[model samples]
Target: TAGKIFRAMYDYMAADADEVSFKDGDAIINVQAIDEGWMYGTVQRTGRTGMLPANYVEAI
Candidate 1:
């Protein structure tokens, strides 16, 4: 099932595997758990699945 929808509130450039770079206003979905404060998300535009900072996005 689809989880919460989110909008990237800030830009993020992922530096490792299973992580993706995103920009403001980009749509992210299926947000899962966090590593400390890093959230796992699916970048919709690039069809990439990865991790991002929890503070960089807002649930919508």
Candidate 2:
């Protein structure tokens, strides 16, 4: 399931990958490995503004 989701995300990025982040849909989903320990940002876009942890979710 994770792999499928990753692929969808990859496609989404390839379509509208950018630094200013002017795309649509849920940009990212904030999550962690344990939901309480060592929380980190996934699907991070390079050169984006802000320091908030977000997910780079995609749809198919």
Candidate 3:
């Protein structure tokens, strides 16, 4: 995948069916911009995919 890597800066608890919970520093790939505050990506360690808080992560 040509997607950029992203690292979570804070713990996020997914509150929707299409979201995934992640801990701080969690690696994510295949990130796509959604709305202004949301991003869609896949968790690296678990292969889980979902929406997440955009401010909670940074491209790394």
Candidate 4:
């Protein structure tokens, strides 16, 4: 479901072209997928979606 929301735990810059970038306190929403080290979600502040480091956010 696209109902869960997570808050950024720290600033995450895309380490590669395929990852997503977000700020330390940003709200990441609509999580659509999750992997061992990454997550796919929409950034609430910018409406951007891509691979975000799983450790960069915490459930809220």
Candidate with maximal lDDT: 3
How well does candidate 3 score on lDDT at residue 32?
A: 74
Candidate 1 C-alpha lDDT tens digits along 1-60: 565578787778777776788899889886577656877767888888888887777778
Residue lDDT tens for model 4, 1-60: 655577887878777767678888888774566667677877777877788777667787
Residue pair clashes in candidate 4: none
RMSD in angstroms, all models? 2.3, 9.4, 2.1, 2.2
Clashing pairs in 2: 28-55, 29-55
Candidate number of the best TM-score: 3
Count clashing pairs, candidate 3: 0
lDDT per residue as tens, model 2, 1-60: 353221113233332322223244334433433232222234443424322212533334
Q: Between 3 and 4, whose lDDT is larger?
A: 3
lDDT of 2 at 21: 35
Candidate 2: 10-residue stretch with minimal lDDT: 4-13
Residue 51's lDDT in candidate 4: 85
Per-candidate Cα lDDT values, in order, are 0.78, 0.31, 0.79, 0.74
Error of 2 at 27 (Å): 2.6
Looking at candidate 1, the ten consecutive residues that score lowest on lDDT are 30-39
What's the residue-level lDDT of 5 in candidate 4? 70
Q: Give me the runs in candidate 3 sitting further than 4 Å from their true place.
A: 1-3
Better of 3 and 4 by TM-score: 3
Question: What lDDT does candidate 3 reach at residue 25?
Answer: 71
